[PDB]
Design a protein around this ligand. Sequence first.
Ligand SMILES: O=c1ccn([C@H]2C[C@H](O)[C@@H](COP(=O)(O)OP(=O)(O)OP(=O)(O)O)O2)c(=O)[nH]1
Ligand SMILES: [Mg+2]
Length: 216
Amino acid sequence: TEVVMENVTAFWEEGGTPVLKDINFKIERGQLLAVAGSTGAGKTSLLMMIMGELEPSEGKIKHSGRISFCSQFSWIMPGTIKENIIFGVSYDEYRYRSVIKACQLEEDISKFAEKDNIVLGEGGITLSGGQRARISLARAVYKDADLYLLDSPFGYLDVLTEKEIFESCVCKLMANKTRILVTSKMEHLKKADKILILHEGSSYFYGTFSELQNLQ
Ligand SMILES: O=c1ccn([C@H]2C[C@H](O)[C@@H](COP(=O)(O)OP(=O)(O)OP(=O)(O)O)O2)c(=O)[nH]1
Ligand SMILES: [Mg+2]
């Protein structure tokens, strides 16, 4: 097992409403967990618990290894698009090119005369929301880690682009890696090894897409 939550309850504020209530799941090494649910349901908070920024009041948690986290709020720091993606990690041409292809960024980059040395975050180019989201995803996927926490990374993307990048990046490029993906899209739940649907902190559903279809 790579990540376990067992009867986890947690609070951001002592004496408040629990942000997570009796949460249970298990991910084996290399599997994909999809975490779904409405705004405020506790999805980012669950990721924060895995990253150690929120401790459980009840229950047990297991996880080891390096984490790579992709925030639901895309961000850019001053520097080239290549510097933003490798972001202090050692550079390898093949690895970098595999990530930008999987994130459909080779298309965007090929159109600039400076190519991967185009400068971001310094008042020149103003990136679209979709461009910033794919750069942020690429940054998180480039990092070598044992666990990838991808919090709603497909912001500003149309449904076909989202589908293509989910398949090329999350399913193929990252096929060997333990992944938690916060997402609500049907294909992503169908392809995940397990699904956790949160509602107001509680487990609305936990199991597989097939199990949910069998309840209809
Ligand atoms: O530092 C924090 C983060 C969250 N909350 C609260 C706000 C909210 O009532 C609850 C759930 O927030 P979360 O960000 O975990 O929800 P989400 O499922 O990620 O919502 P969204 O889909 O809008 O990202 O946790 C806090 O009090 N403090
Ligand atoms: Mg969130």
